[PDB]
Amino acid sequence: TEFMPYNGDGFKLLVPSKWNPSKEKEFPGQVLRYEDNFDATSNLSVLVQPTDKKSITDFGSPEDFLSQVDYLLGVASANVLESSTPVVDGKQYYSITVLTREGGKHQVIAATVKDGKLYICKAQAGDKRWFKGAKKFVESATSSFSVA
Ligand SMILES: [Zn+2]
């Protein structure tokens, strides 16, 4: 109904059914981008980049990882609402929720390491759309992200 599964190269996730794919490359390693055409500040991207790390935990804690992929957030200020270290089907993931700025953005990052690749899912919405229904879309897309 409101969500549709997507299968990429080595990963899958749920994308909101009303968002559309964007052909524009915003970040390096970008392989998917979906956006709300009524408010393009609501969007999501999946990045796949090579790495020498063997685990997401080689990055240090969730907050340490966040500091190393901070280009993804563009910030006068970043506030970490929550972080977690969920394990899905054997794989360690990190998940981080960050609020950046009046003007506010809620960004959720989910990440794991597999096969000499760093796989990053980032979903965001603006503060007002967040509380008006976007929170569901942002959190499902990042919660649903899994690699194989
Ligand atoms: Zn907010």
Author numbering: 16 to 89, 108 to 134, 140 to 186
Paper text:
The analysis of diffraction data to 1.98 Å on such crystals is now reported in the present work. The structure shares with tobacco PsbP the same internal regions that are unresolved in the electron density, and, although the N-terminus is intact in the spinach protein, it too is not resolved. One Zn2+ ion is coordinated by spinach PsbP via the sidechains of His144 and Asp165, corresponding to His142 and Glu163 of CyanoP that coordinate a Zn2+ ion. It has been suggested that one or more of the observed Zn2+-binding sites might be sites for the physiologically relevant ions Mn2+ or Ca2+. If so, this common Zn2+ site might mark a functionally important surface of the protein. In fact the three-dimensional structures of spinach and tobacco PsbP hardly differ, overlaying with an RMSD of 1.07 Å for all 148 resolved Cα-atoms, consistent with their sequence identity of 78% for the 186 residues of the mature protein. The only region of structural difference, at residues 164–173, appears to be related to crystallization. In the x-ray crystal structure with 148 residues resolved, 26 residues are in helical conformation, 75 in β-strands, 23 in turns, and 24 unordered. Crystals of spinach and tobacco PsbP have different space groups and crystal contacts, suggesting that the three regions that are unresolved in both structures might be intrinsically flexible rather than affected by common crystal lattice features. The x-ray crystal structure of PsbP, as well as the modeled structure, shows 75 residues in β-conformation, substantially less than expected from Raman measurements in solution, where at least 87 residues are predicted in β-conformation.
